[PDB]
Amino acid sequence: LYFQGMWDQRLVRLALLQHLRAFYGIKVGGKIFGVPFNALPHSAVPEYGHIPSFLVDACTSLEDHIHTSVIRLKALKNKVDHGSAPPCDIAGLLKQFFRELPEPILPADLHEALLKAQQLGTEEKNKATLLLSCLLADHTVHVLRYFFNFLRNVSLRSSENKMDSSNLAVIFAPNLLQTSEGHEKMSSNTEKKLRLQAAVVQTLIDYASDIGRVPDFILEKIPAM
């Protein structure tokens, strides 16, 4: 995201926040699991930068199965936490990984904003949501661009695996946002929130390649370095 690097990020940030209010009214013990993801072993990944090695290796292992017991899952988690798997279990570990992060990778302060974005009209949800992703720390931006690319790829092959972006979002959203799951006795309010939280994640999947990417109408308002 070189082109946007030609602007003082400080100002880019101010301008994003200004547009979000003006235009939309949105005002803002082991080795792997539970560790802040920035503190984990990273691997240089091309066109994405440095991404945590667990993520890279989990996703890369599932690459070949995109078409496709918590006792057995837990054993693998422990082996991984201590330092080939069935694909099911890798997937299972990816969900647990995000759930167990000290802080949610989509930070809590953005959640309301993200949900608000998801009440806008179709065309404008997408825009707002993507503007919100540009508020993310750029390490996060790169980890998320990588992961959402992986997700997107699963989704694009749904004729086969049956997991479209809606289907994936429902599953991952609670793990990414670190929220509760759907249940039977849900209030009308609790459930609407769930759906919209999944909708956030679904948008992120569908527009994976545009995550963290500042639009020209933002940049246009500012002079560059």
- In order, the DSSP letters of the chain are -HHHHTS-HHHHHHHHHHHHHHHH------SSTTS-GGGSPEEEETTTEEEEHHHHHHHHHHGGGTT--HHHHHHHHHHHHH----HHHHHHHHHHHHHTSSS-SS-GGGHHHHHHHTTS-HHHHHHHHHHHHTTS-HHHHHHHHHHHHHHHHHHHTHHHH---HHHHHHHHHHHHHT-PPP-TT--HHHHHHHHHHHHHHHHHHHTGGGTT---HHHHTTS---
**How many other CB atoms sit within 10 Å of the CB of residue 68?**
13
Cβ contacts of residue 61 below 8 Å, gap of 6+?
Answer: 84, 85, 87, 90
Number of domains in the chain: 1
Resolution at which this structure was determined, Å: 2.3
CA distance 185 to 191: 10
Which CATH number is 59's domain given?
Answer: 1.10.555.10
Is 116:26 a contact under the CB 8 Å cutoff? yes
What is the domain extent for residue 196? 1-225
C-alpha 163 chain-centroid distance? 17
